[PDB]
Each structure stands twice: as structure tokens, then as C-alpha cells.
């Protein structure tokens with residue numbers, strides 16, 4: 001097997017790896033690396049080319065194409081360089097120093113994020129999702145772990161990552177889809193309906209929900225109850241959980257967490273919701 005991207009020797013000569021491990025999947029690892037010429041921090045995502053006996057190089061090439069297509073979009077992480085060795089393709093990505101937006105969804109940071117902050121972050125996410133949709137790209141993995149922040153103090157800007165699930169609209173629901181963290185799946189996935197831009201809008205409702213209440217809207221005692229809640233769209237909107245959340249935000253969330261994907265507004269409409277029309 002011949003290599004397509006720059007040799008590993010070039011990587012070791014231009015970049016420095018640190019002990020800082022930013023993320024570890026089963027066939028991917030994200031390490032912090034630093035340029036030797038500029039000392040600028042980057043994120044090096046190592047992707048194994050073989051997964052479960054299957055040669056997945058073509059799948060990696062797809063994720064690179066999508067990163068390239070959205071380079072002009074500030075809300076999508078930028079791809080700086082690509083390297084390759086025997087078993088890995090290495091993506092050098094713009095470093096997001098703020099980390100996952102999932103941190104803001106936990107009760108221990110609820111006291112530093114206000115409604116005004118959530119409005120800005122949701123507006124930025126919608127901007128990036130609007131771009132992807134305009135290019136017939138559906139992320140299909142818009143969970144808080146795949147949406148990062150440029151900085152945390154002060155709260156920075158949105159950077160969407162992880163395009164391994166990206167597809168053209170209308171693709172067929174494959175096993176890879178209906179096998180993610182159950183609580184972030186859309187009802188149409190469990191039904192095996194085809195892929196639609198509306199699937200990403202469902203996840204945007206979860207993001208907004210978790211940022212404002214700091215709880216998951218669909219997780220249950222076990223996976224079975226999680227699936228039941230998703231298909232039944234059983235979401236807690238009680239006064240206890242929403243005593244401090246505005247009605248406009250409640251309306252925004254409820255318009256996106258609807259079973260029928262047809263009834264969900266598009267990314268362009270969401271940007272016109274009264275809740276986001278805040279004269280910052």
C-alpha cells in the first residue's frame with residue numbers, strides 16, 4: 001500500500017507532540033502538537049485506516065473533503081495539513097483551546113453561562129450548520145462533544161468538529177448512524193427514515209436544552225427508556241427545570257424537538273427566531 005499524504009518523517013520534523021491528549025476514540029486519537037517554526041499550537045487527529053478489518057481510507061478522504069469544503073466558514077474547524085504513515089492518516093487541525101461545549105452543560109459551570117451567552121453560542125452553531133446545509137452536508141453527530149470553543153475565559157467562538165458521519169442529504173440510514181450515543185439520536189433515525197437536514201436541527205434543540213437546564217432531555221434509567229423518550233418526544237418542561245429559563249428560549253427548543261422532521265424549522269428560519277434577535 002502506497003501513501004498519498006506527506007510522509008511521517010516530515011511530521012516529526014515540523015511538529016512536536018505533547019503529552020496533552022485531547023481525545024481518544026476506538027480508531028482515533030487527538031493529541032496536541034506544536035509547530036517548530038512558529039510554536040503555534042495545533043490539534044493532531046490520528047485516524048486509523050483499518051477498522052474492524054475494513055479499509056476505511058476512503059472514509060477518511062471523505063472527512064478531509066468536507067473540512068476543505070467548509071474552510072471559509074469560521075464556525076467549522078480548519079484543516080491545516082494532512083500527514084500519513086503505515087496505519088494512520090494525521091489531520092492537523094486548528095486548535096480549539098476552550099474545549100467541548102459539553103462543559104457548559106454540566107451543573108458545576110451553570111453559574112458562568114447566562115442566557116445571553118447561550119444565545120450567542122446557539123446563533124454561531126446555527127451559522128455553521130446553515131453553511132453545511134447550503135452545501136448539502138448533514139453533520140449527523142451534532143452532540144456537545146463535537147462542538148468546541150476557541151476559548152473559555154472569556155467565552156470564545158464555536159468550532160464544529162468530527163465530520164466522520166457527514167453525508168449528502170437523502171443518504172440511507174446505515175448502521176454507523178443508529179449506533180451512536182442513544183440520547184442524541186433523532187426519532188427518524190430509530191425509524192430508519194432517510195437522512196435529512198432536519199436531523200441536525202433536532203440535535204440543536206438538545207444543545208440549547210442542555211445549555212439552559214444543564215440536564216439531558218432524553219436520557220433515562222437505561223437505553224430502553226432513552227429510546228422510548230426519544231420516539232415519544234418525552235421532554236421535561238416543568239416549572240422546576242424552567243423556572244429560570246425564558247419563554248422565548250422554551251419556544252425555540254420546543255419548535256426543534258418535534259417528532260416529525262418536516263415540522264422542524266430550517267437553520268435559516270431558526271436564525272430568525274425572536275429569541276436570537278437580541279440586540280447585543
Ligand SMILES: Nc1ncnc2c1ncn2[C@@H]1O[C@H](COP(=O)(O)OP(=O)(O)OP(=O)(O)O)[C@@H](O)[C@H]1O
Pocket residue numbers: 022023024025027028030043045077093094095096097099100145146148161162163164
Ligand atoms: N481541533 C481540536 N481542538 C481541541 N480539541 C479537539 C479538536 N478536535 C477534537 N478535539 C477533541 O478530541 C475529541 C475527539 O475528537 P473528534 O470528535 O473529532 O473524533 P472522535 O469522535 O473521537 O472519532 P471519529 O471521528 O472516528 O468518530 C473531541 O471530543 C474534542 O474534545
Ligand SMILES: [Mg+2]
Pocket residue numbers: 145146162
Ligand atoms: Mg466525536
